[PDB]
Structure 1
């Protein structure tokens, strides 16, 4: 099905007059907000509420040091702000930042059984912050095992009679928790549907949030235009008609990985790769034959334009674009002297292709492997080790050691990959089946364990839940690499929720600005 979108993004000229206006006022609001953070004698609840709000407004990327030093101090002082609301929020904010605060802070809210006091069922703000906190738990937090089911049933009961915009904030949290949501997507919802309508809102912060979001959106629009032209200069809708034309969606994905302005070059490179590999996926799935695919897989392994002649004409266009894309990457990084790290992304792409081939081999043969074998292959075909490696290309700070760490398949990356795999398979267990795909994810699980379709999807969900707990542990200090390089992996898992349907998000993020 083609693109709802058209040439709607090919053209975009940033009215520099308006951009400079926004920037100038932002710089002022930025210092005002900074001073708010550096405020002396603030109660704990207030300081947490301030940090939470600046994060939800999507402007916390300006105060990384300030917010860190404040949470560090809160971590080390271990003061007991005894209410549920302040505790849960304190827990969440610290854990999201890597501080391993003990979960025994939730003991005072539980009876002799490790279960939450049913008497807290009437504290809505407390239930909400507990709910949000329940999604950042690791394997060592069994104390919170019932926190999610507890806060959920009561939030659902109380929701209908709450005042706005709290009613809306609660209904939305029950459909999408903050921790696992895409940053920009949650920021857009918070600013306009909640905070803007909040009676006690801080005008300086709302103004700041609206201006910043709109100004960065200008940058995203420029990037998407640049990328839309690049995509038309390839004429893949014309020279190679079988693939999906989802360059806007691919941009959304890159945008979900990181939205900050400093990751502009990074976002652009990443979109090109996501769009490129989407074609290779389309080739192996709905086009190429057993012989052609084998030639394609081999050509990719060699990685030399000379092998092009062994490939039929259509695959020649794909193959050349791919090699040229990586040549551009090498060229873009030539300046800093990081052109060289590009091979890491290439090695991951070859791996994706190998497993693509293996996947079609299993389909032809009618092979239903055991879950163990299925995953040893099906994990790379999610393309996540590949996109994750690609996301480091544009990050000027990425060193060789960061790529080295990533190539060893760290548990946090492994977890992110599993989430996409398991979610995709649960989502594609019935459709894929009628297209006669035999080595489906869940069938392998069904024939391997002796469980039904229901039990197999249920077991896959636990795999995803386990994976989230692993991602959360992966964030805890000391981190194997700087947090800057863990966030892209976390975001890749977030995008999964968000996707497993994109039109609304694209409109809210790339079409409509936030009306002031």
Structure 2
């Protein structure tokens, strides 16, 4: 059964968290072969392998086709690098004759397939011809003079002269390709690039090359310890203790299953936070040179989990021209790093210039990549498309999870100088659990919708012709999906349906007098004025009043005491704003921007759909805390502001055509003669953008008295308006994906 399989996967993933160390990463043939080339001198003066275990690994790990590499993941550049270095290692030590022969055959066959249109792997044009030069000196028979191969050698020779002609020798941005630049390196000057663990850019191949030329003891210790840890081989990079923790957390949260791992996540993030630095971070705690990907992932993930981190860490990766780079130790810019840069920018607080710069660079870069470089029919296209089309402030949690389940690749191989696996980060258990859990939670939502449809009938809403499908749309907008908040979602959906009903009532039907009558009835919180309004409005009031009774009875159970006095206020405020709107409309009055917002930021309706539902979540809301989490707290007011203004930009045109003059647009223009509608819309969008960032700041802001679950419900109500009233797919598609179609498991 689903629940049983999910339960054991949760146990298995928790074990993974508990077992986190320096990182789970595959052996690297290219790196292990470089380590295998290293010599030591015996007592008698003869040369022998310094690391015989590494040589033996090479000896024993040739693939069936004669190459070395990752068997199920063939890539031409990877296989050529792995195989050529492996044949070099065996040849140097006069061993593995048969493997050398078959290796040379593979290389010769595949050099004939390397062409000018093949996408070459990072620094391949430097590190590969360096291997060919060595192979040729060892007398290995390969077609070195094929046109494109000669071209690679010539390009490398130009790079060599650039370094030798450089006053300061090898520049930082060539560090990634150190071992391909051996014959021109200044071995004294290069040592300034060494990490505290003795490695060079965490790369065992590069570290072996430095060791070969210098004898440096710290290089030896890094390699010796790494071989011991891996049982006689090495990976392409180590350690990866920061990247692995951050990405495991990020992936789990993104997949929609983070609620199962709260304690494990806190543990992983506490570890990373200890190693967090104003200069950014690299894959591992000992990196001298940090990288954009790990730093951006760090900024986003730590911030998302309430840690205090500064966006200024991003300035470490920005050049004079406002462009970002992945690492000072390389020349190529990695697409994944730019994706994570954009995702980190989603969590900007107000006036964080580094986030502004990050997004201004990353967004065009990603859109350019989607339009020019990425194949439409891939998980990567879908993933990045979602990143830019549904960014954080318009990302509904279940939609985000559902999309990522389809774009998460659980059989992925990473590319740096060569290919490698990180089994914690491309993980079939994580994906399987995400699918099972989504289905289980979905069944819960389906039952909630079943109860809501039953209520739709029994309450009388069906009788008064409330649209059945509107129920599901309000329900979807609740956003806070976790199983423990069923009662809150159900109450929110009932109240939202009445608010939809009320708004239509106030427009299409009610006169001002009838509106005032209805409102006085709300203020009295009784049925004493039902007689003053039309039968249809009476029915509306009665459905609402009955709901209030049922909901308030439930609030007494959860909160431990009567909270009617609190609960009455938002309903009074809401209806009073309705009368104010109508008074202005009949008087043809256009308020100032400030005066407009004072009324319309309330009338948009965040008050009623939040107070009663957040009181059913479970957290204690003390009398003095109501105003700190609900109206008029800053976060609440900011969400309200985003609601009203975003709605205005989307709908003010249609409203004007119906005789409604007051809007954010019209009122700003009245305050500001000379400002066009376009100017007002631009200003309003800036106000909304800032309000969303400010709400984010307020949300993550630590407090000793404000309940975070309640804050989360209010904060995540910002999403529905951003997604529906944004200045492709529609609501029916969202509901299908989230509530109707299960995921094939």
Preserved contact between residue 571 and residue 607 of structure 2 (Cα < 8 Å): no
Task: Classify 1:55/1:118 alpha carbon distance in 2 versus 1 (closer, same or farther; 3 Å).
Answer: closer
Q: Distance in 2 between matches of 1:39 and 1:134?
A: 31
Structure 2 counterparts to residues 490-501 of structure 1, below 5 A: 490-500=715-725, 501=730
Q: Distance in 2 between matches of 1:507 and 1:136?
A: 28
The answer on 1:22 being equivalent to 2:233 is no
The answer for the alignment partner of 2:599 in structure 1 is: 377
Q: Distance in 1 between matches of 2:252 and 2:532?
A: 56
Q: Distance in 2 between matches of 1:368 and 1:203?
A: 59
Q: Which moved more, 1:70-79 or 1:463-472?
A: 70-79
Q: Distance in 2 between matches of 1:407 and 1:208?
A: 35
1:401-442, Cα deviation, whole Å (9 max, x unpaired): 442423451211111111111110000121111001011221
The answer on 1:315 being equivalent to 2:529 is no
Q: Structure 1: any 5+ residue segments left out of the alignment?
A: 1-20
Task: Classify 1:186/1:67 alpha carbon distance in 2 versus 1 (closer, same or farther; 3 Å).
Answer: same
Task: Classify 1:393/1:166 alpha carbon distance in 2 versus 1 (closer, same or farther; 3 Å).
Answer: same
The answer on 1:192 being equivalent to 2:406 is yes
Structure 2 counterparts to residues 7-86 of structure 1, below 5 A: 21-41=1-21, 42=23, 43-78=241-276, 80-81=281-282, 82-86=290-294
Task: Classify 1:245/1:55 alpha carbon distance in 2 versus 1 (closer, same or farther; 3 Å).
Answer: closer
For the aligned residues, what is the CA RMSD? 2.2
Task: Classify 1:179/1:355 alpha carbon distance in 2 versus 1 (closer, same or farther; 3 Å).
Answer: closer
Preserved contact between residue 266 and residue 391 of structure 1 (Cα < 8 Å): yes
1:126-183, Cα deviation, whole Å (9 max, x unpaired): 1100111111111252122221120111112222423621122112212112454111
1:397 to 616, 619, 631: 619
1:456 to 680, 702, 716: 680
1:5-26, Cα deviation, whole Å (9 max, x unpaired): xxxxxxxxxxxxxxxx211221
The answer for the alignment partner of 1:148 in structure 2 is: 359
Question: Aligned-pair distance for 1:125?
Answer: 0.5
Preserved contact between residue 559 and residue 621 of structure 2 (Cα < 8 Å): no
Preserved contact between residue 331 and residue 339 of structure 1 (Cα < 8 Å): no
The answer for the alignment partner of 2:339 in structure 1 is: 128
Give SS of 1:515's match.
coil
Q: Distance in 2 between matches of 1:140 and 1:454?
A: 24
Preserved contact between residue 319 and residue 325 of structure 2 (Cα < 8 Å): yes
Question: Aligned-pair distance for 1:365?
Answer: 1.3
Q: Distance in 2 between matches of 1:411 and 1:333?
A: 24
Give SS of 2:626's match.
helix
Question: Aligned-pair distance for 1:243?
Answer: 7.7
Preserved contact between residue 100 and residue 476 of structure 1 (Cα < 8 Å): no
The answer for the alignment partner of 2:350 in structure 1 is: 139
Preserved contact between residue 242 and residue 283 of structure 1 (Cα < 8 Å): no
The answer on 1:285 being equivalent to 2:507 is yes
1:168 to 370, 382, 386: 382
Q: Distance in 1 between matches of 2:625 and 2:399?
A: 28
1:331-386, Cα deviation, whole Å (9 max, x unpaired): 32444454623543331111111101111111111111110100000011111133
1:412 to 635, 657, 661: 635
The answer for the alignment partner of 1:4 in structure 2 is: none
Q: Which moved more, 1:405-414 or 1:94-103?
A: 405-414
- How many residue pairs match? The answer is 493
Structure 2 counterparts to residues 75-114 of structure 1, below 5 A: 75-78=273-276, 80-81=281-282, 82-112=290-320
Preserved contact between residue 342 and residue 359 of structure 2 (Cα < 8 Å): yes
The answer on 1:472 being equivalent to 2:690 is no
Higher relative contact order (CA 8 A, sep 6+): 1
Question: Aligned-pair distance for 1:302?
Answer: 1.1
The answer for the alignment partner of 1:513 in structure 2 is: 742
Question: Aligned-pair distance for 1:63?
Answer: 1.4
Q: Distance in 1 between matches of 2:471 and 2:14?
A: 37
Preserved contact between residue 227 and residue 268 of structure 1 (Cα < 8 Å): yes
Task: Classify 1:284/1:198 alpha carbon distance in 2 versus 1 (closer, same or farther; 3 Å).
Answer: farther
Question: Aligned-pair distance for 1:444?
Answer: 1.1
In the superposition, the TM-score normalised over structure 2's length comes to 0.63
Q: Distance in 1 between matches of 2:409 and 2:509?
A: 49
Question: Aligned-pair distance for 1:212?
Answer: 0.5
Task: Classify 1:179/1:303 alpha carbon distance in 2 versus 1 (closer, same or farther; 3 Å).
Answer: closer
Which structure is higher in helix share? 1
Question: Aligned-pair distance for 1:391?
Answer: 2.9
Structure 2 counterparts to residues 477-492 of structure 1, below 5 A: 477-479=701-703, 481-492=706-717
> Which structure's CA Rg is the greater one?
2
Q: Distance in 2 between matches of 1:265 and 1:75?
A: 36
